[PDB]
Design a protein around this ligand. Structure first.
Ligand SMILES: NC(=O)c1ccc[n+]([C@@H]2O[C@H](COP(=O)([O-])OP(=O)(O)OC[C@H]3O[C@@H](n4cnc5c(N)ncnc54)[C@H](OP(=O)(O)O)[C@@H]3O)[C@@H](O)[C@H]2O)c1
Ligand SMILES: Nc1nc(=O)c2nc(CNc3ccc(C(=O)N[C@@H](CCC(=O)O)C(=O)O)cc3)cnc2[nH]1
Ligand SMILES: [Mn+2]
Ligand SMILES: [Mn+2]
Ligand SMILES: [Mn+2]
Length: 159
């Protein structure tokens, strides 16, 4: 099974200038809990944005060019990325925009955080047809002293 996980600001913005400008520790905790001990697939730009391997996960990087770091696994196509994960129950695709576009048709589950923040961005999450997805979990949180915007965690499953 393939799942996508992402955090979206208003208008489905996911990034700006190869960065995420907000800081929401509760969402990073949700990301870690839902990805630990699973393989994670990311594109090369997101690998450069993160800047180091994510511990406790098999890190698979999609790039058309040879890898430059043997702490992670480099693959050259979607099919190779999937095969490199082996026979696991759940593969997590962690972006960015171009990578989400390619895996969305193959995904059975979306883990989405909706952040109530207006962000100038240059990268968006793909348009997804709402009729194809059922919301199976949602949890709203007001802003607090650690998290400066309200946010909604949602899990959707393909119908
Ligand atoms: N809010 C969130 O949840 C979230 C999550 C992830 C990322 N982001 C943000 O998203 C942005 C990065 O997104 P992005 O769309 O620019 O880039 P991306 O999807 O991270 O990376 C695209 C790169 O991945 C490689 N790639 C993608 N598909 C491939 C394929 N089929 N075969 C081979 N290589 C492939 C290519 O690398 P080569 O050029 O080396 O071939 C391509 O240029 C940043 O702003 C980051 O902060 C946000
Ligand atoms: N919901 C969600 N939030 C995100 O921030 C996110 N980020 C990415 C890509 N970028 C990043 C950037 C940093 C870290 C990171 O530092 N993660 C640590 C945090 C642990 C914690 O804060 O408790 C990790 O071990 O996962 C992960 C992904 C992809 N999907 C996401 N999905
Ligand atoms: Mn092929
Ligand atoms: Mn197999
Ligand atoms: Mn806000």
């Amino acid at each position: 099974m393939i799942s996508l996980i992402a955090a979206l600001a208003v208008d489905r913005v996911i990034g700006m200038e190869n960065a995420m400008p907000w800081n929401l520790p509760a969402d990073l905790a949700w990301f870690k809990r839902n990805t630990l001990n699973k393989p994670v697939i990311m594109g090369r730009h997101t690998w450069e944005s993160i800047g180091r391997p994510l511990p406790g996960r098999k890190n698979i990087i999609l790039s058309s060019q040879p890898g430059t770091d043997d702490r992670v696994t480099w693959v050259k196509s979607v099919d190779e990325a999937i095969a490199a994960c082996g026979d696991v129950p759940e593969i997590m695709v962690i972006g960015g925009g171009r990578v989400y576009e390619q895996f969305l048709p193959k995904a059975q589950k979306l883990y989405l955080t909706h952040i109530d923040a207006e962000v100038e961005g240059d990268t968006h999450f793909p348009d997804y047809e709402p009729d194809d997805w059922e919301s199976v979990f949602s949890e709203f949180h007001d802003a607090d002293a650690q998290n400066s915007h309200s946010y909604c965690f949602e899990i959707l499953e393909r119908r």
